[PDB]
Amino acid sequence: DSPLYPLLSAAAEFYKQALKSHPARKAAVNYLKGRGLTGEIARDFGLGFAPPGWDNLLKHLGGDNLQLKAMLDAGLLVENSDTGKRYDRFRDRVMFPIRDSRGRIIAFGGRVLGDDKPKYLNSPETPVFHKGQELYGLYEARQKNRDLDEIMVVEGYMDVIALAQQGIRNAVATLGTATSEEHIKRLFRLVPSILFCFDGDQAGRKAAWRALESVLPNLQDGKRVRFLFLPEGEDPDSLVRAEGEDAFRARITQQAQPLAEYFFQQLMLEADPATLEGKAHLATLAAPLLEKIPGNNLRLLMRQRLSEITGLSGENIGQL
């Protein structure tokens, strides 16, 4: 219970109250209406509106220099570290408040309603917001279902919101970060099954391997992890609005790839085990990764597949 929480909470109350009754609301409300995000979904995710300009939240919250430092530390202001000039971090944007386990607003995402870049702006790291520990939408998914079987991990705010609007309400998002081991530990405390969904771009494919590396040291027996790769140029946002819930669920069932198949596929592309050298190279890449799996059956199962492909024993694999 620190002083950043009330400021963040007041900021959120400001941003959604402007979404309702602010002069510039037209562009914002049209985005939400233009995506079916009105009413139900907007309330579930506390959507708001940051009006255009430099100091709307500043001139609305104010405070002495100690309050101002707390707004900066909460990520609500940007300060020029040379001149001290300060202004709202989030300007002319649709606002996505981020909540922790207890429902407390800890940070914000914002989508631009103009031409200024970046289209999506995250909060910086703050004492109440750590990007490697938090997942956007985790609070909202736990509210919708207390006994979740599976969590879907996606890359962006609108992926979570678009999916929720289509009836897929167990999606959470990393916040422009690689999935961390701490992310995996929190997900596995809630569900035995994680479905990763990656955009059709090179950053999506790189993020899948980093996600697999975060998963391995936390992969106990009886857990289930899969990777769904979307067609080039797509993300869950665009895709699910295009083809709808039923088709996206069919796509998952059809095309989600098991972790173990993704693991051996990618490594066999790096080290082709047709030859004696490729077999040794493949075992040299795989073994240190497999050694980290804590689940004893799964570690044995992956070692066994590696042995079948490479013809190398454990003594061979160890000595290599």
Swiss-Prot record:
- List positions binding Mg(2+) 1: E155, D199
Q: What does this protein do?
A: RNA polymerase that catalyzes the synthesis of short RNA molecules used as primers for DNA polymerase during DNA replication.
The residues covered by the Toprim domain are 149-231
Q: Which family does it belong to?
A: Belongs to the DnaG primase family.
Q: What is this protein called?
A: DNA primase
Residues the record lists as binding Mg(2+) 2 = D199, D201
Domain topic, free-text comment: Contains an N-terminal zinc-binding domain, a central core domain that contains the primase activity, and a C-terminal DnaB-binding domain.
- Locate the transmembrane regions by residue number: none
Quaternary structure, from the entry: Monomer. Interacts with DnaB.
